[PDB]
Amino acid sequence: GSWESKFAKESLTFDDVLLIPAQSDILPKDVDLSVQLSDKVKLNIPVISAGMDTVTESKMAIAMARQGGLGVIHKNMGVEEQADEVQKVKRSGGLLVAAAIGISKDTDIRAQKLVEAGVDVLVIDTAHGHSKGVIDQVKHIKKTYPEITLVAGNVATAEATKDLFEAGADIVKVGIGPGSICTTRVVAGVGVPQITAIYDCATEARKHGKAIIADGGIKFSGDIIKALAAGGHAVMLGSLLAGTEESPGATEIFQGRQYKVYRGMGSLGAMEKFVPEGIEGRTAYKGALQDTIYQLMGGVRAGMGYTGSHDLRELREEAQFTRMGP
Amino acid sequence: GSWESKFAKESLTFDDVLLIPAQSDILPKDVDLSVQLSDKVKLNIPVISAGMDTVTESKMAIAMARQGGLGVIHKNMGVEEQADEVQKVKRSGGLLVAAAIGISKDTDIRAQKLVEAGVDVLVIDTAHGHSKGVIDQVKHIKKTYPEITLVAGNVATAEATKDLFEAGADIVKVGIGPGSICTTRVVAGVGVPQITAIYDCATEARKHGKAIIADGGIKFSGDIIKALAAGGHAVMLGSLLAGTEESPGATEIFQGRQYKVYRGMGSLGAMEKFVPEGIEGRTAYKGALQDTIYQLMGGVRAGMGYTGSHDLRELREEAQFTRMGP
Amino acid sequence: GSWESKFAKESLTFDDVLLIPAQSDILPKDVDLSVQLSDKVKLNIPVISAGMDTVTESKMAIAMARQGGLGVIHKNMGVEEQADEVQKVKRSGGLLVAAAIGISKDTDIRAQKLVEAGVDVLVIDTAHGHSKGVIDQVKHIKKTYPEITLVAGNVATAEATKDLFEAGADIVKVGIGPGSICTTRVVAGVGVPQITAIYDCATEARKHGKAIIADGGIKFSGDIIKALAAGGHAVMLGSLLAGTEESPGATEIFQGRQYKVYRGMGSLGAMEKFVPEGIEGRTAYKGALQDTIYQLMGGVRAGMGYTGSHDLRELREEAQFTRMGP
Amino acid sequence: GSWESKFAKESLTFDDVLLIPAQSDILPKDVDLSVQLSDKVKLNIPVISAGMDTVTESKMAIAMARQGGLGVIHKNMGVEEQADEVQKVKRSGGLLVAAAIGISKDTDIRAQKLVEAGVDVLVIDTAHGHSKGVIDQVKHIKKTYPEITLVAGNVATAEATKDLFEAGADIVKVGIGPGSICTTRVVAGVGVPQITAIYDCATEARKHGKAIIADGGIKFSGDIIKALAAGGHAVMLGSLLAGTEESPGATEIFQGRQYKVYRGMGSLGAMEKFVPEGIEGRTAYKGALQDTIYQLMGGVRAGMGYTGSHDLRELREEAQFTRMGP
Ligand SMILES: C[C@H](Nc1ccc2ncc3c(c2c1)CCOC3)C(=O)Nc1ccc(Cl)nc1
Ligand SMILES: C[C@H](Nc1ccc2ncc3c(c2c1)CCOC3)C(=O)Nc1ccc(Cl)nc1
Ligand SMILES: C[C@H](Nc1ccc2ncc3c(c2c1)CCOC3)C(=O)Nc1ccc(Cl)nc1
Ligand SMILES: C[C@H](Nc1ccc2ncc3c(c2c1)CCOC3)C(=O)Nc1ccc(Cl)nc1
Ligand SMILES: O=c1[nH]cnc2c1ncn2[C@@H]1O[C@H](COP(=O)(O)O)[C@@H](O)[C@H]1O
Ligand SMILES: O=c1[nH]cnc2c1ncn2[C@@H]1O[C@H](COP(=O)(O)O)[C@@H](O)[C@H]1O
Ligand SMILES: O=c1[nH]cnc2c1ncn2[C@@H]1O[C@H](COP(=O)(O)O)[C@@H](O)[C@H]1O
Ligand SMILES: O=c1[nH]cnc2c1ncn2[C@@H]1O[C@H](COP(=O)(O)O)[C@@H](O)[C@H]1O
């Protein structure tokens, strides 16, 4: 019964687990960081910059794509402005570009202009992916544009992952409540500790032979490899990339120290009705994206050498974790 | 044996659990927040202001009732003064009003005057509801006034909930030691982590077809929905409402910042013999109650949309939680 | 095998548990706080002041005994001086008095002089009670003085409790590493979380029909009732009593605030070779012992009313706990 | 399946466990602290100073050996300079000396010069011992120099311990991520909580009849005895010894207080490509090594008396632990 099972489930977060070292014949410099997200999308590094207004526009998307990654242009701008940002990326050496779409009335014209601008991947980006409004949008976007790779989310269960893959999504984005700037857990009382969310969703994805994006809660390079080893094909970063020069924000000074503004897409300012589910704050200026990425991938490479993971397929399928206390 | 089972039980609090997101066809704006506490009592929002001297008098009770909620007038005043506070609420558009009663000698005349003043619900409010003094009072008040909805508490077990429902209570109030200002755990060594207390008591309540009030420990809107999803029909708030203008306290200033006094009904000052089980302190001035309630219900609505809970019956009966570590 | 079972055991401390409230017909004022520690020793309150140099001498022992408790005169003084301290207590209205004895050469003459001074209970007080030196001393002291109540400790297992009771002890004192000023856990890597230590030792004591003293780690009145409900007949306090006027220390002033010195009997200063296992520090001046005791017993009474424990026998045998997280 | 077992393993650290006190006929002064690491290597105390540049050179190695211990001369210097440091130790009364070797090209000439200088034990010191590069080096060094005691590591599993012992190692060094200055867990996402790592590796070592070194994470004397009781034959210290006069660092002054530099062998400065896995910081000046060791062994002796461990064989094989919460 539903009553009896209320408190049955146990979930894990990044800080609850560590990768166990294993037999390795491969050096960190020699590991393969590439991942196939779909038939058309192949990334050299498993990192995607977040579809947020304090994180990704053309400057971030170009820089990300030049590192072998990908950037999701945020939808908190006009249809034309978004298509123009997509154009800048494509005109920068035919770089892979992703763009965010919602469920609202404006989606129909937005998706056409983005596809027209030469977008590679469309991202149905919502707070609650396990909904009718989102399922219908997935069916619609996939019927209208079958050549464009479709990402749909956010979800945190196997049932939600099943339903999105069945509706027509190519990639499912996982994460409900783990984000650094997220207040959903405290406001709505809802969330799935991210390691369990990734694992439960990837368990389902493995059946469909499809990819998942581990979105939110990544604090360091160690969280990146843990997110991939739990089942994620690629990770999505907000906090770790917001402080870089390439993020759309303006560099500010406060008591000598250089800072950049980072906020939730559900914060008061970003929403400009729904009660806020995100915060707005300050994050230290990081410098060039390229240097942030190099440090992050260095740590991921170190971990793949420790686990004897020659590639990401060997990490996702074979790497073992140990649970531990605080 | 009693000896062998000493440490058998495991209990959970709000911070130990989160609601798992589920299939949803309903938007937060569209969810139904109403709850039937008894045949005569129907609330538009599942919130009740606490029967405390730094929380509820006529000003709080009117404001609460105008939001679709309910206020429990505290019993730390004279019989006539209490009846007059009840009168003010009833004379304010026939608003639903609740009033607190004890077990002491003065209860007999107090209950008559409150009923005379047009009270809708009587609350036998004690520290230890699983007692002979309380069982007898429930039988007495229900025989004398069968038309008035009777709330009895506080309890934290199924056995206590059974005994109150059998004695004649319509609603059982759950909470032993979780209150923000409570020191019972540290003083008396007694308590039941509130999520388990609600669930164990609601498991019993479901058999009798009766309602339970989740009383104490609520820090944010996320704790409200967790308390309801664990089995509570409505929640009781102290701390979250004490800082509002409508609370009986006087607005004070200390080093520029505006504060309001909030104290336990078992603190030294409130008791004015029993050793203190509550603290007296300062809480930031919140402003209008109406705005505090709107933010709180906004978060509860967000959570009901995440879980696909069209109403509170679907939340209490079907919503699933995950346990997690610190 | 010993190898396979290395990490089998799980242990609990005070902060891991709470008493579950139960059916109660008794009020806190009406509960019985008396306990029979032996055929000759009957205490009105289950509290014993610690056999420490910053805690108990004649002034503490008299004050303790006048509250219905007991004081253990420390052995960090001359034989004659100790006997004189015992005399002062006996000459103060025939008050019950306890005195500490070791295992060293001086024990033989010390025990005779203390018995001569009219001591009621002798305490073989050691860091490691589960030893040959201690077993032999128990046999010796019990053969030589069969009319004097013998306490032996400290221990933290059933096997140790069995061996002391079999050697001739009347009461076994439980506690290895829980003391507020103790550093044994960090220095020696040894300890048994105190709730489990009490329960495991009391499980053994129940077979012999004998009493146990829950010694160390008590921070508040809630820890007192938890220690008794876990199986302890009486508790021993260091930290909670050291700040009182009756403790042998001198009242000092530091930056306006009044303090008293409290130290481990295994600290550098107290030892005046063994590496230190205790710390020396400052504790706030508490005032009169009588007031400290009244507050503490008030909390214990509150808890006995919550659990429906009319007496300590009903607490120790029937009271149930719940485990919980941080 | 590998997928299903991803989160099966549970691991423990020092802070998760305590030694249970047991029947003891031995006093701390009387316990035997000696350990046989190999046929040729016998230590009077189970302590080895770390093969680090802010910890061990000739001055540390001589002082360690004079306490009955051992020092591993670090390999972050020239071949001749290392052999000269080894010479100074041997010329200081034929004291036991250990020296670090890697897997790199320079290893072949380095190992010859160290053996020529009269080294007793060679240490193949790596970040990831469960590798082909390390297995091959073990086979090579053991074939070329069968008279010199070979230590190989670092590892954290039974499989890794098996493979090193089979390749020709005499002693396996255990520790992946527990070091005070280590950032591997946060950078690479890899680690095995040290108590479990020691126990899992020693379970394997017991089959081969060989010794293991518990390396890293030791904060106090309590962690030393816990590391040995979990299966370690001897411990390796970095942090605890870095502040002593005998460490190669220079004594510095900062705001009155005396400090010494302590850094990871994977920190930026020490590496002078791999991303850093260690930090560089300041540690308080401790004084003479001899005094640090005396305090540490005093605590280990206290613990062996509590557990009735007459020797280290009785500790490793019979001592029992209890798990506990935070
Ligand atoms: C106001 C709030 N705004 C956002 C915006 C962007 C987000 N982006 C990612 C994530 C979340 C986000 C929340 C929350 C869950 O974690 C991932 C939001 O839309 N609330 C909401 C609540 C319930 C339902 Cl049914 N629909 C929507
Ligand atoms: C002094 C103390 N005062 C209060 C007052 C209001 C309360 N209101 C709610 C709650 C508690 C309260 C305690 C404590 C448990 O959590 C809920 C109280 O009456 N102690 C008490 C102890 C044992 C028994 Cl048999 N009877 C009464
Ligand atoms: C130096 C240290 N001094 C004390 C003094 C008083 C104590 N009083 C109570 C307790 C402890 C105490 C330790 C430690 C355990 O918790 C209770 C002590 O004697 N160490 C010790 C170690 C091993 C063995 Cl075989 N024998 C003795
Ligand atoms: C840069 C990093 N430097 C060090 C240096 C000394 C160490 N010494 C002891 C330990 C560790 C150490 C790491 C890390 C694990 O804990 C014990 C290192 O070499 N990374 C590394 C990563 C993966 C692989 Cl396949 N190979 C090497
Ligand atoms: O306001 C918000 N509430 C909750 N989650 C958010 C909000 N805005 C963005 N997110 C999520 O948080 C992620 C970033 O997480 P981070 O990398 O930990 O900062 C984004 O990629 C979104 O999925
Ligand atoms: O002094 C007291 N001791 C213990 N609980 C108290 C005391 N006074 C009130 N309470 C409870 O605490 C609740 C308020 O909890 P809060 O909303 O967390 O502040 C009240 O509704 C009472 O049930
Ligand atoms: O130096 C010491 N090391 C360890 N335990 C000690 C020491 N001195 C006294 N104790 C114990 O600590 C108890 C006091 O604990 P407290 O009430 O938590 O301060 C005493 O009654 C002794 O059993
Ligand atoms: O940079 C590094 N990263 C990780 N571990 C390190 C590093 N340098 C040394 N170690 C390990 O840390 C141990 C010292 O640990 P400690 O005694 O806790 O400071 C050394 O003996 C090495 O095994």
Author numbering:
A (entry chain A), B (entry chain A), C (entry chain A), D (entry chain A): 0 to 93, 220 to 397, 413 to 466
Give the authors' words.
The novel S. aureus and E. coli structures crystallize with one molecule in the asymmetric unit (asu), yet re-create the common GuaB tetramer arrangement via the fourfold symmetry operator of their I4 space group. Common to all three species’ structures, the amino- and carboxy-terminal ends of the protein are engaged in mutually reciprocal strand swaps with their neighboring protomer around the tetramer. We observed a tight overlay of structures across the bacterial strains, highlighting common critical interactions required for potency. These inhibitors mimic the NADH/IMP cofactor interactions by forming strong π-π stacking interactions with IMP while also hydrogen bonding with the conserved glycine (Gly299Ab/302Sa/300Ec) which is one of the two hydrogen bond interactions observed with the NADH amide. The ligand linker segment induces a 90° bend, directing either the amide N-H of G2 and G1 or the imidazole of G8 to form an important hydrogen bond to the conserved glutamic acid (Glu416Ab/417Sa/415Ec) while directing the aryl tail group into a hydrophobic shelf region. Differences in the polarity of a particular key selectivity residue specifically (Ser250 in E. coli versus Ala252 in S. aureus and Ala249 in A. baumannii) was found to be critical for inhibitor interaction with GuaB which corroborates the observations of previous reports. The key residues (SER-440 and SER-250) in the binding site of GuaB E. coli contribute to a stable and extensive water network (more green and well-connected spheres) predicted by WaterMap analysis with the pseudo-apo crystal structures. To disrupt such water network, the compound needs to pay a larger desolvation penalty leading to poor potency, whereas the same compound binding to GuaB in S. aureus and A. baumannii does not need to pay for such penalty with a less favorable water network (more red and less connected spheres).
GuaB catalyzes the oxidation of the substrate inosine-5´-monophosphate (IMP) to xanthosine 5´-monophosphate (XMP) using NAD+ as a cofactor, and guanosine 5´-monophosphate (GMP) synthase converts XMP to guanosine 5'- monophosphate (GMP) to generate guanine nucleotides essential for cell growth and viability. Indeed, genetic studies have shown that de novo guanine biosynthesis is essential for growth and viability of bacteria both in vitro and in vivo (10–23). Here, we present the first high resolution co-crystal structures of A. baumannii, S. aureus, and E. coli GuaB proteins (cystathionine beta-synthase (CBS) domains deleted), each determined with a matched set of three different inhibitors bound. Similarly, the NAD+ binding region, also where our compounds bind, occurs at the junction between neighboring molecules with side chains from both protomers contributing to ligand binding interactions.
